[PDB]
């Protein structure tokens, strides 16, 4: 897990030897793994590249971070408001700093991860201090231009 780098944000043009060919300049990528879905039978955008040394994986994570690969925000990492279609290049501290401009955050946010890879699932949950920050996130942040990924902010629970 230390020598392997988890890549997120892969489109349909990216393939299993294509990621190994793109990561060959960063370091000696020994193997590439792409988990296939059960309903569609294709990649879900997240994969793994197992290299030989941990320094090559660190250089690939520091070089290929927030890159625009196949029209997709590909990024390598070390393997009541709901935000969907978020970029995997952002972290919890980066999401807390991005959410601090609209309103005040009550605590540190959390992002959902896949049970197989564990880098990024695609959705996240963040809680605001009051309902005014949630309304400002649903008015402004729900549709704002993020890092090559259109996010969507919505209410997790609402009572009619």
């Amino acid at each position: 897990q230390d020598a392997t780098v988890y890549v997120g944000g892969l489109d349909e043009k990216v393939s299993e030897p294509l990621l190994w060919e793109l990561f060959l300049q960063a370091g000696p990528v020994v193997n590439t793994h792409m988990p296939k879905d059960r309903v569609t039978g294709q990649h879900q955008g997240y994969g793994f590249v197992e290299f030989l040394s941990e320094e090559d994986a660190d250089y690939a994570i520091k070089i290929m971070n927030m890159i625009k690969l196949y029209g997709k925000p590909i990024r390598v990492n070390k393997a009541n408001i709901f935000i969907g279609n978020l970029d995997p290049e952002i972290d919890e501290k980066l999401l807390y700093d991005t959410f601090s401009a609209f309103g005040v955050i009550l605590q540190t946010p959390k992002i959902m991860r896949d049970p197989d890879t564990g880098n990024s699932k695609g959705y996240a949950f963040i809680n605001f201090a009051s309902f005014d920050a949630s309304d400002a996130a649903i008015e402004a942040m729900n549709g704002q231009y993020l890092c090559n990924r259109p996010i969507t902010v919505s209410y997790a629970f609402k009572k009619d």
């Binding site: 009051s130 309902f131 005014d132 309304d135």
Partner: protein
């Protein structure tokens, strides 16, 4: 982080003995080729340096132990218990004020989510 904290404590001790706002022992040190990034207010350590300077100024008070001796806080446990009870009452009043502010914010959020947003009038 011990050397930076010691430098901040030395700057707070040297700046508290000044007779003016700008005529201090640290303003002339900035022009004497001494790098001090904690003097600018843009850094996060400046908020702690201001609290250290405030504590150094409060350590120079006449009831702080320079020319007088405290008798109520040092020789009366009942006065300390009354001060602790007053601090607990002030904390309870602050918690009640925060609960009232949260209730007012919830009432404003309930009133804003129930008003009609289709009756537009441009005058």
């Amino acid at each position: 982080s011990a050397f930076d904290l010691d430098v901040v404590k030395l700057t707070a001790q040297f700046v508290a003995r000044n007779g003016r706002q700008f005529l201090t022992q640290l303003m002339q040190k900035e022009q004497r080729n001494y790098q001090f990034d904690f003097l600018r207010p843009q850094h996060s350590l400046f908020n702690y340096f201001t609290k250290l300077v405030e504590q150094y100024t409060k350590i120079l008070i006449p009831p702080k132990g320079l020319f007088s001796k405290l008798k109520k806080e040092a020789e009366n446990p009942r006065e300390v218990l009354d001060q602790v009870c007053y601090r607990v009452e002030w904390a309870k009043f602050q918690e009640r004020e925060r609960k009232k502010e949260e209730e007012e914010k919830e009432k404003e959020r309930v009133a804003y989510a129930q008003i009609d947003w289709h009756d537009f009038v441009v005058v």
